[PDB]
């Protein structure tokens, strides 16, 4: 046979450090890696990112569009105009082919 190491044995991570969090074999490094993930991942990103998204105003002008629609529905109805016409473009602005 060639010169090769034997396969390493299975290890129980909790045997030496029963407070293991999954991050590091050094206990102090382990707990601070755990805290950084929970603080930056959850306390900062998930809470404040959620807050910031929640207070983005008029996202994609959805609030303006409903406000504008009510203004037009109001206007188009008191004056007796149709609510919505078939032609988006006024036909006077279009020159069709003679044929």
């Amino acid at each position: 046979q060639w010169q090769e190491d034997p396969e390493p044995e299975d290890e129980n991570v909790y045997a030496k450090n029963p407070d293991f969090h999954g991050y590091d074999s050094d206990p102090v490094v382990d707990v601070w890696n755990m805290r950084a993930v929970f603080f930056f991942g959850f306390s900062i990103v998930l809470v404040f990112g959620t807050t910031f998204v929640a207070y983005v105003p008029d996202y994609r002008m959805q609030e303006w569009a409903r406000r504008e629609a009510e203004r037009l529905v109001k206007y188009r109805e008191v004056n007796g105009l149709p609510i919505m016409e078939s032609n988006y473009f006024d036909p006077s602005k279009i020159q069709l082919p003679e044929d």
Binding site: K93, I94, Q95, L96, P97
Partner: protein, 120 residues
């Protein structure tokens, strides 16, 4: 394509007519990137010689950064000049041949009948 053009000096890196162009900024992003490559070259050289990558030979590292920026500035000046000459020739040729480059009067979309292709 441009080599045989009028007033072409042989093996001239920077013709005197190039001195009318604005020179590149010394913090031009292309020159900043050149200096970064010189810094990488110094670090890679340290690695290949089994030296401390960041610590060894700061004099050697500084020369690598300065050479890349120094060479890059003058090469960038030459490249600016060649592109300027290309535009000078192209536009000058356009003016001498107005029959090959007519101004095409474009029509508004009120007159153009594009076909409609229903999606369904």
């Amino acid at each position: 394509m441009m080599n045989g053009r009028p007033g072409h000096e042989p093996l001239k890196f920077l013709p005197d007519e190039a001195r009318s162009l604005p020179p590149p900024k010394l913090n031009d992003p292309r020159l900043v990137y050149m200096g970064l490559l010189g810094y990488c070259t110094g670090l890679m050289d340290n690695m290949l010689r089994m030296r401390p990558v960041m610590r060894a030979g700061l004099h050697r590292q500084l020369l690598f950064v300065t050479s890349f920026v120094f060479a890059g500035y003058f090469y960038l000046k030459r490249q600016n000049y060649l592109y300027a000459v290309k535009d000078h020739d192209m536009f000058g040729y356009i003016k001498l041949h107005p029959e090959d480059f007519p101004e095409k009067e474009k029509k508004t979309y009120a007159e153009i009948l594009e076909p409609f292709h229903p999606v369904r």
